Chain length 128, copies 4
Amino acid sequence: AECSVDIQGNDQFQFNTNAITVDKSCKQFTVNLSHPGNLPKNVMGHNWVLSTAADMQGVVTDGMASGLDKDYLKPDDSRVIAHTKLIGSGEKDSVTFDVSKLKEGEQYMFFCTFPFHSALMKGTLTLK
Amino acid sequence: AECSVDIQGNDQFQFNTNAITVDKSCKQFTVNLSHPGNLPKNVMGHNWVLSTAADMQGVVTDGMASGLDKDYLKPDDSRVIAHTKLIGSGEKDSVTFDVSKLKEGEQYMFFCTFPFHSALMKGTLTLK
Amino acid sequence: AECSVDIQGNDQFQFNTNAITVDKSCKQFTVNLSHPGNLPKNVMGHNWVLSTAADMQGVVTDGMASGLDKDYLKPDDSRVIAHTKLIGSGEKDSVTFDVSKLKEGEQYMFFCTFPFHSALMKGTLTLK
Amino acid sequence: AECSVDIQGNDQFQFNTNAITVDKSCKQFTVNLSHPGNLPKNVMGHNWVLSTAADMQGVVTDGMASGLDKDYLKPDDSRVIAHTKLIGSGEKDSVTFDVSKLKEGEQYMFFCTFPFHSALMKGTLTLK
Ligand SMILES: [Cl-]
Ligand SMILES: [Cl-]
Ligand SMILES: [Cu+2]
Ligand SMILES: [Cu+2]
Ligand SMILES: [Cu+2]
Ligand SMILES: [Cu+2]
Ligand SMILES: [Cu+2]
Ligand SMILES: [Cu+2]
Ligand SMILES: [Cu+2]
Ligand SMILES: [Cu+2]
Protein backbone atom coordinates (compact mmCIF):
# COMPACT_ATOMS: atom_id res chain seq x y z
CA ALA A 1 0.00 0.00 0.00
CA GLU A 2 1.12 3.59 -0.50
CA CYS A 3 2.51 5.34 2.58
CA SER A 4 2.61 8.92 1.38
CA VAL A 5 0.23 11.60 0.16
CA ASP A 6 0.82 14.81 -1.80
CA ILE A 7 -1.20 17.75 -0.43
CA GLN A 8 -1.56 21.30 -1.77
CA GLY A 9 -2.75 24.49 -0.15
CA ASN A 10 -3.66 27.25 -2.60
CA ASP A 11 -4.63 30.95 -2.68
CA GLN A 12 -8.31 29.96 -2.20
CA PHE A 13 -8.10 28.84 1.46
CA GLN A 14 -8.21 25.17 0.44
CA PHE A 15 -6.35 21.93 0.81
CA ASN A 16 -6.92 19.55 -2.10
CA THR A 17 -8.23 16.77 0.15
CA ASN A 18 -10.38 16.61 3.28
CA ALA A 19 -9.75 12.96 4.17
CA ILE A 20 -6.47 11.06 4.49
CA THR A 21 -6.31 7.29 4.93
CA VAL A 22 -3.17 5.69 6.38
CA ASP A 23 -2.95 1.98 5.65
CA LYS A 24 -2.38 -0.02 8.85
CA SER A 25 0.49 -1.87 7.13
CA CYS A 26 2.51 1.36 6.83
CA LYS A 27 5.36 1.77 9.30
CA GLN A 28 5.99 5.41 8.37
CA PHE A 29 3.78 7.91 6.62
CA THR A 30 4.88 10.96 4.60
CA VAL A 31 2.94 14.13 3.76
CA ASN A 32 4.42 16.24 0.93
CA LEU A 33 2.91 19.73 1.14
CA SER A 34 3.23 22.33 -1.61
CA HIS A 35 1.79 25.81 -2.24
CA PRO A 36 0.95 26.32 -5.93
CA GLY A 37 -0.56 29.74 -5.18
CA ASN A 38 0.97 33.15 -5.87
CA LEU A 39 0.60 34.74 -2.44
CA PRO A 40 3.43 34.95 0.10
CA LYS A 41 3.49 33.19 3.44
CA ASN A 42 2.77 36.33 5.50
CA VAL A 43 -0.72 36.64 3.93
CA MET A 44 -1.47 33.08 2.70
CA GLY A 45 0.93 30.74 4.49
CA HIS A 46 -0.07 27.10 4.98
CA ASN A 47 1.11 24.22 7.09
CA TRP A 48 -0.14 20.69 7.62
CA VAL A 49 -0.62 19.83 11.29
CA LEU A 50 -1.91 16.56 12.78
CA SER A 51 -3.56 16.18 16.19
CA THR A 52 -6.36 14.30 17.85
CA ALA A 53 -9.79 15.75 17.17
CA ALA A 54 -10.07 16.74 20.84
CA ASP A 55 -6.78 18.69 20.63
CA MET A 56 -7.42 20.46 17.30
CA GLN A 57 -9.10 23.58 18.69
CA GLY A 58 -6.41 24.21 21.30
CA VAL A 59 -3.61 23.70 18.78
CA VAL A 60 -5.28 26.09 16.32
CA THR A 61 -6.07 28.66 19.03
CA ASP A 62 -2.62 28.61 20.65
CA GLY A 63 -0.96 28.38 17.24
CA MET A 64 -2.72 31.44 15.74
CA ALA A 65 -1.30 33.58 18.55
CA SER A 66 2.34 32.61 18.00
CA GLY A 67 2.84 34.71 14.86
CA LEU A 68 4.55 34.30 11.50
CA ASP A 69 7.93 33.94 13.30
CA LYS A 70 6.83 30.72 15.07
CA ASP A 71 5.09 29.21 11.99
CA TYR A 72 1.82 29.73 13.90
CA LEU A 73 2.50 26.87 16.32
CA LYS A 74 2.92 27.28 20.07
CA PRO A 75 6.50 26.26 20.98
CA ASP A 76 6.88 22.81 22.55
CA ASP A 77 3.21 21.95 21.89
CA SER A 78 3.01 18.25 22.78
CA ARG A 79 -0.46 18.03 21.22
CA VAL A 80 1.10 18.13 17.73
CA ILE A 81 1.58 14.55 16.48
CA ALA A 82 3.36 15.65 13.28
CA HIS A 83 3.54 18.76 11.11
CA THR A 84 5.22 20.51 8.19
CA LYS A 85 6.75 23.95 8.26
CA LEU A 86 4.65 26.93 7.16
CA ILE A 87 5.10 27.62 3.44
CA GLY A 88 4.11 30.32 0.97
CA SER A 89 3.90 30.55 -2.83
CA GLY A 90 6.27 28.24 -4.65
CA GLU A 91 7.59 26.49 -1.52
CA LYS A 92 7.22 22.88 -0.41
CA ASP A 93 7.92 20.80 2.69
CA SER A 94 7.60 17.14 3.70
CA VAL A 95 7.04 15.44 7.06
CA THR A 96 7.44 11.75 7.85
CA PHE A 97 6.12 10.26 11.09
CA ASP A 98 5.87 6.83 12.70
CA VAL A 99 2.49 5.16 12.20
CA SER A 100 2.85 3.67 15.70
CA LYS A 101 1.98 7.18 16.95
CA LEU A 102 -1.62 6.57 15.78
CA LYS A 103 -4.15 4.25 17.40
CA GLU A 104 -7.40 2.64 16.36
CA GLY A 105 -10.52 3.81 18.14
CA GLU A 106 -8.90 7.26 18.21
CA GLN A 107 -9.80 9.74 15.49
CA TYR A 108 -7.49 12.40 14.08
CA MET A 109 -7.73 15.75 12.32
CA PHE A 110 -5.27 17.54 10.04
CA PHE A 111 -5.46 21.29 9.52
CA CYS A 112 -3.57 24.50 8.77
CA THR A 113 -2.89 26.83 11.72
CA PHE A 114 -2.44 30.06 9.78
CA PRO A 115 -5.01 32.52 11.25
CA PHE A 116 -8.59 31.51 10.42
CA HIS A 117 -7.66 29.00 7.69
CA SER A 118 -8.65 25.89 9.67
CA ALA A 119 -12.37 26.62 9.21
CA LEU A 120 -11.94 25.32 5.65
CA MET A 121 -8.38 23.85 5.68
CA LYS A 122 -9.09 20.75 7.76
CA GLY A 123 -9.95 17.11 7.32
CA THR A 124 -9.88 13.69 8.89
CA LEU A 125 -6.99 11.25 9.12
CA THR A 126 -7.78 7.61 9.84
CA LEU A 127 -6.05 4.26 10.01
CA LYS A 128 -7.52 1.40 8.01
CA ALA B 1 -27.58 28.77 23.95
CA GLU B 2 -29.11 28.03 20.56
CA CYS B 3 -30.23 24.43 20.00
CA SER B 4 -30.85 24.46 16.27
CA VAL B 5 -28.94 25.02 13.05
CA ASP B 6 -30.11 25.83 9.52
CA ILE B 7 -28.23 23.83 6.87
CA GLN B 8 -28.41 24.03 3.07
CA GLY B 9 -27.34 21.63 0.36
CA ASN B 10 -27.05 23.19 -3.09
CA ASP B 11 -26.48 22.22 -6.75
CA GLN B 12 -22.69 22.44 -6.18
CA PHE B 13 -22.28 19.31 -4.01
CA GLN B 14 -21.95 21.41 -0.85
CA PHE B 15 -23.40 21.88 2.58
CA ASN B 16 -23.01 25.42 3.89
CA THR B 17 -21.12 24.28 7.00
CA ASN B 18 -18.56 21.58 7.78
CA ALA B 19 -18.69 21.80 11.59
CA ILE B 20 -21.69 21.76 13.92
CA THR B 21 -21.41 22.49 17.64
CA VAL B 22 -24.14 21.30 20.01
CA ASP B 23 -24.10 23.11 23.34
CA LYS B 24 -24.01 20.65 26.25
CA SER B 25 -26.90 22.55 27.88
CA CYS B 26 -29.25 21.64 25.02
CA LYS B 27 -31.77 18.89 25.74
CA GLN B 28 -32.87 18.58 22.12
CA PHE B 29 -31.19 19.69 18.93
CA THR B 30 -32.85 20.55 15.61
CA VAL B 31 -31.37 20.56 12.09
CA ASN B 32 -33.43 22.44 9.46
CA LEU B 33 -32.26 21.32 6.02
CA SER B 34 -33.21 23.09 2.79
CA HIS B 35 -32.23 22.75 -0.88
CA PRO B 36 -31.96 26.17 -2.56
CA GLY B 37 -30.71 24.55 -5.78
CA ASN B 38 -32.65 24.00 -9.00
CA LEU B 39 -31.98 20.30 -9.54
CA PRO B 40 -34.45 17.55 -8.61
CA LYS B 41 -33.86 14.93 -5.95
CA ASN B 42 -33.19 12.09 -8.42
CA VAL B 43 -29.99 13.82 -9.65
CA MET B 44 -29.07 16.16 -6.75
CA GLY B 45 -30.95 14.95 -3.68
CA HIS B 46 -29.54 15.71 -0.23
CA ASN B 47 -30.13 14.48 3.27
CA TRP B 48 -28.47 15.20 6.60
CA VAL B 49 -27.40 12.04 8.43
CA LEU B 50 -25.60 11.76 11.78
CA SER B 51 -23.47 8.82 12.92
CA THR B 52 -20.30 8.11 14.80
CA ALA B 53 -17.16 8.65 12.76
CA ALA B 54 -16.47 4.90 12.86
CA ASP B 55 -19.94 4.17 11.41
CA MET B 56 -19.95 6.84 8.67
CA GLN B 57 -18.41 4.73 5.89
CA GLY B 58 -20.77 1.79 6.44
CA VAL B 59 -23.82 4.06 6.56
CA VAL B 60 -22.75 5.81 3.35
CA THR B 61 -21.86 2.54 1.61
CA ASP B 62 -25.03 0.68 2.60
CA GLY B 63 -27.11 3.81 2.04
CA MET B 64 -25.88 4.46 -1.54
CA ALA B 65 -27.12 0.99 -2.54
CA SER B 66 -30.69 1.45 -1.29
CA GLY B 67 -31.82 3.73 -4.12
CA LEU B 68 -33.92 6.85 -4.49
CA ASP B 69 -36.96 4.93 -3.16
CA LYS B 70 -35.31 4.36 0.26
CA ASP B 71 -33.87 7.91 0.54
CA TYR B 72 -30.44 6.27 0.16
CA LEU B 73 -30.49 4.79 3.67
CA LYS B 74 -30.44 1.08 4.44
CA PRO B 75 -33.74 0.18 6.16
CA ASP B 76 -33.55 -0.29 9.94
CA ASP B 77 -29.95 0.97 10.06
CA SER B 78 -29.26 1.29 13.79
CA ARG B 79 -26.02 3.18 13.08
CA VAL B 80 -28.05 6.30 12.16
CA ILE B 81 -28.34 8.53 15.24
CA ALA B 82 -30.64 11.05 13.51
CA HIS B 83 -31.42 12.12 9.96
CA THR B 84 -33.65 14.18 7.67
CA LYS B 85 -35.49 12.89 4.65
CA LEU B 86 -33.87 13.23 1.22
CA ILE B 87 -34.90 16.49 -0.46
CA GLY B 88 -34.53 18.09 -3.88
CA SER B 89 -34.86 21.64 -5.25
CA GLY B 90 -37.22 23.83 -3.27
CA GLU B 91 -37.92 21.28 -0.51
CA LYS B 92 -37.03 21.38 3.18
CA ASP B 93 -37.09 19.02 6.15
CA SER B 94 -36.28 19.23 9.87
CA VAL B 95 -35.09 16.62 12.38
CA THR B 96 -35.01 16.98 16.16
CA PHE B 97 -33.11 14.51 18.35
CA ASP B 98 -32.31 14.06 22.02
CA VAL B 99 -28.88 15.39 22.99
CA SER B 100 -28.60 12.51 25.48
CA LYS B 101 -27.93 10.33 22.41
CA LEU B 102 -24.48 11.98 22.15
CA LYS B 103 -21.53 11.42 24.47
CA GLU B 104 -18.31 13.23 25.25
CA GLY B 105 -15.10 11.49 24.24
CA GLU B 106 -17.04 10.20 21.22
CA GLN B 107 -16.77 12.09 17.94
CA TYR B 108 -19.51 12.38 15.34
CA MET B 109 -19.85 13.03 11.61
CA PHE B 110 -22.76 14.39 9.59
CA PHE B 111 -23.03 13.75 5.86
CA CYS B 112 -25.31 13.28 2.87
CA THR B 113 -25.81 9.70 1.62
CA PHE B 114 -26.84 10.49 -1.94
CA PRO B 115 -24.35 8.60 -4.19
CA PHE B 116 -20.84 10.06 -3.96
CA HIS B 117 -21.87 13.32 -2.27
CA SER B 118 -20.32 12.50 1.12
CA ALA B 119 -16.79 13.08 -0.22
CA LEU B 120 -17.57 16.81 0.02
CA MET B 121 -20.93 16.88 1.91
CA LYS B 122 -19.64 15.94 5.36
CA GLY B 123 -18.48 17.57 8.56
CA THR B 124 -18.00 17.13 12.26
CA LEU B 125 -20.57 17.37 15.03
CA THR B 126 -19.32 17.90 18.58
CA LEU B 127 -20.67 18.59 22.04
CA LYS B 128 -19.21 21.51 23.95
CA ALA C 1 -39.76 34.56 -12.60
CA GLU C 2 -38.07 35.24 -9.27
CA CYS C 3 -36.14 38.51 -9.04
CA SER C 4 -34.23 37.98 -5.82
CA VAL C 5 -31.64 35.63 -4.39
CA ASP C 6 -30.61 34.87 -0.80
CA ILE C 7 -26.82 34.62 -0.39
CA GLN C 8 -24.75 33.66 2.65
CA GLY C 9 -21.11 34.19 3.50
CA ASN C 10 -19.81 32.00 6.32
CA ASP C 11 -16.73 31.51 8.53
CA GLN C 12 -15.23 29.19 5.86
CA PHE C 13 -14.43 31.85 3.22
CA GLN C 14 -17.43 30.81 1.12
CA PHE C 15 -20.54 32.15 -0.50
CA ASN C 16 -23.27 29.53 -0.89
CA THR C 17 -23.47 30.01 -4.67
CA ASN C 18 -20.98 30.70 -7.46
CA ALA C 19 -23.47 31.52 -10.22
CA ILE C 20 -26.42 33.93 -10.20
CA THR C 21 -28.95 34.09 -13.03
CA VAL C 22 -31.08 37.22 -13.46
CA ASP C 23 -34.16 36.61 -15.59
CA LYS C 24 -34.38 39.13 -18.45
CA SER C 25 -38.02 39.81 -17.49
CA CYS C 26 -36.97 41.24 -14.12
CA LYS C 27 -37.06 45.03 -13.81
CA GLN C 28 -35.26 45.06 -10.46
CA PHE C 29 -33.13 42.43 -8.78
CA THR C 30 -32.52 41.99 -5.04
CA VAL C 31 -29.63 40.25 -3.26
CA ASN C 32 -30.26 39.44 0.44
CA LEU C 33 -26.89 38.76 2.08
CA SER C 34 -26.51 37.21 5.53
CA HIS C 35 -23.58 36.00 7.66
CA PRO C 36 -24.50 32.83 9.59
CA GLY C 37 -20.93 32.53 10.91
CA ASN C 38 -19.66 33.36 14.39
CA LEU C 39 -16.75 35.63 13.51
CA PRO C 40 -16.93 39.43 13.63
CA LYS C 41 -16.65 41.71 10.63
CA ASN C 42 -13.09 42.87 11.43
CA VAL C 43 -11.74 39.33 10.84
CA MET C 44 -14.42 37.69 8.64
CA GLY C 45 -16.51 40.49 7.15
CA HIS C 46 -18.32 39.87 3.85
CA ASN C 47 -19.99 42.00 1.25
CA TRP C 48 -21.57 41.25 -2.11
CA VAL C 49 -20.20 43.45 -4.91
CA LEU C 50 -21.12 43.37 -8.60
CA SER C 51 -18.91 44.60 -11.46
CA THR C 52 -17.96 43.66 -14.98
CA ALA C 53 -15.43 40.87 -15.19
CA ALA C 54 -12.86 43.33 -16.58
CA ASP C 55 -13.35 45.63 -13.55
CA MET C 56 -13.32 42.95 -10.83
CA GLN C 57 -9.57 42.96 -10.15
CA GLY C 58 -9.35 46.74 -9.84
CA VAL C 59 -12.39 46.90 -7.55
CA VAL C 60 -10.95 44.15 -5.33
CA THR C 61 -7.47 45.68 -5.32
CA ASP C 62 -8.59 49.25 -4.62
CA GLY C 63 -11.22 47.99 -2.19
CA MET C 64 -8.83 45.90 -0.05
CA ALA C 65 -6.77 49.04 0.63
CA SER C 66 -9.66 51.15 1.94
CA GLY C 67 -9.92 49.42 5.32
CA LEU C 68 -12.68 48.23 7.62
CA ASP C 69 -13.90 51.85 7.98
CA LYS C 70 -14.76 52.11 4.25
CA ASP C 71 -16.32 48.60 4.01
CA TYR C 72 -13.31 47.69 1.84
CA LEU C 73 -14.57 49.68 -1.16
CA LYS C 74 -12.76 52.66 -2.66
CA PRO C 75 -14.97 55.75 -2.20
CA ASP C 76 -16.87 56.89 -5.30
CA ASP C 77 -15.82 53.78 -7.26
CA SER C 78 -17.91 54.02 -10.44
CA ARG C 79 -16.93 50.46 -11.39
CA VAL C 80 -19.32 49.09 -8.73
CA ILE C 81 -22.68 48.31 -10.37
CA ALA C 82 -24.35 47.38 -7.06
CA HIS C 83 -23.27 46.18 -3.62
CA THR C 84 -24.29 45.42 -0.04
CA LYS C 85 -22.65 46.79 3.06
CA LEU C 86 -19.95 44.73 4.77
CA ILE C 87 -21.44 42.46 7.45
CA GLY C 88 -20.15 40.21 10.21
CA SER C 89 -21.65 37.39 12.30
CA GLY C 90 -25.39 37.62 12.74
CA GLU C 91 -25.88 40.64 10.45
CA LYS C 92 -27.70 40.92 7.14
CA ASP C 93 -28.10 43.45 4.34
CA SER C 94 -30.04 43.69 1.07
CA VAL C 95 -29.36 45.56 -2.18
CA THR C 96 -31.81 46.15 -5.02
CA PHE C 97 -30.65 47.40 -8.42
CA ASP C 98 -32.18 48.13 -11.81
CA VAL C 99 -31.78 45.28 -14.29
CA SER C 100 -31.39 47.90 -17.05
CA LYS C 101 -27.87 48.42 -15.64
CA LEU C 102 -26.92 45.02 -17.13
CA LYS C 103 -26.44 44.21 -20.80
CA GLU C 104 -26.32 41.08 -22.90
CA GLY C 105 -22.99 40.22 -24.48
CA GLU C 106 -21.40 41.65 -21.33
CA GLN C 107 -20.44 39.26 -18.54
CA TYR C 108 -20.46 40.07 -14.83
CA MET C 109 -18.79 38.89 -11.64
CA PHE C 110 -19.91 39.13 -8.02
CA PHE C 111 -17.41 38.89 -5.18
CA CYS C 112 -16.51 39.91 -1.63
CA THR C 113 -13.86 42.63 -1.24
CA PHE C 114 -12.72 41.80 2.28
CA PRO C 115 -8.93 41.19 2.04
CA PHE C 116 -8.12 38.02 0.10
CA HIS C 117 -11.65 36.57 0.21
CA SER C 118 -12.39 37.06 -3.50
CA ALA C 119 -10.09 34.17 -4.47
CA LEU C 120 -12.90 31.87 -3.29
CA MET C 121 -15.82 34.30 -2.68
CA LYS C 122 -16.67 35.05 -6.31
CA GLY C 123 -18.97 33.89 -9.06
CA THR C 124 -20.69 34.81 -12.27
CA LEU C 125 -23.85 36.85 -12.77
CA THR C 126 -25.65 36.54 -16.09
CA LEU C 127 -28.86 37.66 -17.75
CA LYS C 128 -31.02 35.01 -19.39
CA ALA D 1 6.43 34.01 -17.89
CA GLU D 2 5.15 30.48 -17.32
CA CYS D 3 2.95 29.06 -20.09
CA SER D 4 1.56 25.99 -18.37
CA VAL D 5 -0.56 25.10 -15.37
CA ASP D 6 -1.01 21.84 -13.46
CA ILE D 7 -4.66 21.15 -12.58
CA GLN D 8 -6.19 18.36 -10.50
CA GLY D 9 -9.72 17.03 -10.25
CA ASN D 10 -10.39 14.90 -7.18
CA ASP D 11 -13.07 12.66 -5.64
CA GLN D 12 -14.69 15.74 -4.03
CA PHE D 13 -16.10 17.34 -7.21
CA GLN D 14 -13.33 19.95 -7.25
CA PHE D 15 -10.62 21.38 -9.42
CA ASN D 16 -7.72 22.84 -7.44
CA THR D 17 -8.09 26.28 -9.02
CA ASN D 18 -11.00 28.45 -10.16
CA ALA D 19 -9.00 31.06 -12.08
CA ILE D 20 -6.33 30.60 -14.76
CA THR D 21 -4.24 33.47 -16.09
CA VAL D 22 -2.51 33.13 -19.47
CA ASP D 23 0.29 35.65 -19.94
CA LYS D 24 -0.13 37.59 -23.19
CA SER D 25 3.51 36.84 -24.06
CA CYS D 26 2.80 33.10 -24.27
CA LYS D 27 2.55 31.66 -27.78
CA GLN D 28 1.23 28.29 -26.58
CA PHE D 29 -0.37 27.30 -23.31
CA THR D 30 -0.42 23.84 -21.70
CA VAL D 31 -2.85 22.40 -19.14
CA ASN D 32 -1.65 19.22 -17.37
CA LEU D 33 -4.67 17.54 -15.78
CA SER D 34 -4.41 14.71 -13.26
CA HIS D 35 -6.89 12.78 -11.08
CA PRO D 36 -5.41 12.02 -7.64
CA GLY D 37 -8.72 10.51 -6.48
CA ASN D 38 -9.57 6.84 -6.06
CA LEU D 39 -12.79 6.67 -8.08
CA PRO D 40 -12.97 5.40 -11.66
CA LYS D 41 -13.89 7.51 -14.66
CA ASN D 42 -17.40 6.05 -15.04
CA VAL D 43 -18.46 7.56 -11.67
CA MET D 44 -15.96 10.42 -11.13
CA GLY D 45 -14.38 11.17 -14.51
CA HIS D 46 -12.99 14.66 -15.14
CA ASN D 47 -11.90 16.64 -18.15
CA TRP D 48 -10.74 20.20 -18.65
CA VAL D 49 -12.69 22.03 -21.36
CA LEU D 50 -12.28 25.64 -22.50
CA SER D 51 -14.97 27.75 -24.19
CA THR D 52 -16.29 31.27 -24.22
CA ALA D 53 -18.54 32.08 -21.29
CA ALA D 54 -21.50 32.37 -23.67
CA ASP D 55 -20.84 28.85 -25.03
CA MET D 56 -20.23 27.10 -21.69
CA GLN D 57 -23.83 26.08 -20.98
CA GLY D 58 -24.38 24.60 -24.44
CA VAL D 59 -21.10 22.68 -24.33
CA VAL D 60 -21.93 21.29 -20.88
CA THR D 61 -25.52 20.46 -21.85
CA ASP D 62 -24.67 18.81 -25.17
CA GLY D 63 -21.62 17.16 -23.63
CA MET D 64 -23.48 15.54 -20.69
CA ALA D 65 -25.73 13.73 -23.18
CA SER D 66 -22.91 12.13 -25.19
CA GLY D 67 -22.02 9.48 -22.60
CA LEU D 68 -18.86 7.96 -21.17
CA ASP D 69 -17.97 6.62 -24.66
CA LYS D 70 -17.66 10.16 -26.11
CA ASP D 71 -15.80 11.61 -23.08
CA TYR D 72 -18.98 13.65 -22.44
CA LEU D 73 -18.35 16.00 -25.38
CA LYS D 74 -20.64 16.33 -28.39
CA PRO D 75 -18.70 15.16 -31.48
CA ASP D 76 -17.37 17.93 -33.73
CA ASP D 77 -18.36 20.63 -31.23
CA SER D 78 -16.76 23.78 -32.67
CA ARG D 79 -17.50 25.68 -29.45
CA VAL D 80 -14.64 23.82 -27.70
CA ILE D 81 -11.48 25.95 -27.90
CA ALA D 82 -9.28 23.27 -26.27
CA HIS D 83 -9.76 20.28 -23.98
CA THR D 84 -8.19 17.23 -22.35
CA LYS D 85 -9.51 13.72 -22.51
CA LEU D 86 -11.74 12.46 -19.69
CA ILE D 87 -9.68 10.77 -16.96
CA GLY D 88 -10.34 8.73 -13.84
CA SER D 89 -8.30 7.77 -10.76
CA GLY D 90 -4.57 7.65 -11.37
CA GLU D 91 -4.71 8.94 -14.96
CA LYS D 92 -3.39 12.17 -16.45
CA ASP D 93 -3.64 14.07 -19.73
CA SER D 94 -2.20 17.28 -21.18
CA VAL D 95 -3.50 19.72 -23.80
CA THR D 96 -1.53 22.47 -25.53
CA PHE D 97 -3.27 25.18 -27.56
CA ASP D 98 -2.30 28.31 -29.46
CA VAL D 99 -2.74 31.50 -27.44
CA SER D 100 -3.77 33.27 -30.67
CA LYS D 101 -7.09 31.42 -30.26
CA LEU D 102 -7.90 33.78 -27.35
CA LYS D 103 -8.79 37.46 -27.61
CA GLU D 104 -8.88 40.40 -25.24
CA GLY D 105 -12.29 41.82 -24.44
CA GLU D 106 -13.57 38.24 -24.65
CA GLN D 107 -13.90 36.24 -21.44
CA TYR D 108 -13.45 32.49 -21.12
CA MET D 109 -14.54 29.67 -18.83
CA PHE D 110 -12.97 26.28 -18.15
CA PHE D 111 -15.02 23.42 -16.74
CA CYS D 112 -15.52 19.66 -16.54
CA THR D 113 -18.35 18.18 -18.64
CA PHE D 114 -18.91 14.99 -16.66
CA PRO D 115 -22.62 15.03 -15.64
CA PHE D 116 -23.37 17.76 -13.10
CA HIS D 117 -19.73 18.46 -12.18
CA SER D 118 -19.56 21.89 -13.83
CA ALA D 119 -21.66 23.47 -11.07
CA LEU D 120 -18.51 23.35 -8.93
CA MET D 121 -15.78 22.32 -11.45
CA LYS D 122 -15.52 25.60 -13.34
CA GLY D 123 -13.51 28.78 -13.36
CA THR D 124 -12.35 31.71 -15.42
CA LEU D 125 -9.51 31.87 -17.92
CA THR D 126 -8.15 35.29 -18.86
CA LEU D 127 -5.33 36.83 -20.84
CA LYS D 128 -3.17 39.42 -19.12
CL1 LIG E 1 -14.18 17.10 8.26
CL1 LIG F 1 -16.28 31.57 -11.54
CU1 LIG G 1 2.51 -0.81 1.08
CU1 LIG H 1 -3.38 27.89 5.51
CU1 LIG I 1 -29.82 27.75 25.38
CU1 LIG J 1 -26.28 15.29 -1.28
CU1 LIG K 1 -41.18 37.04 -12.58
CU1 LIG L 1 -15.74 37.97 2.59
CU1 LIG M 1 7.58 33.37 -20.42
CU1 LIG N 1 -15.51 16.19 -13.36
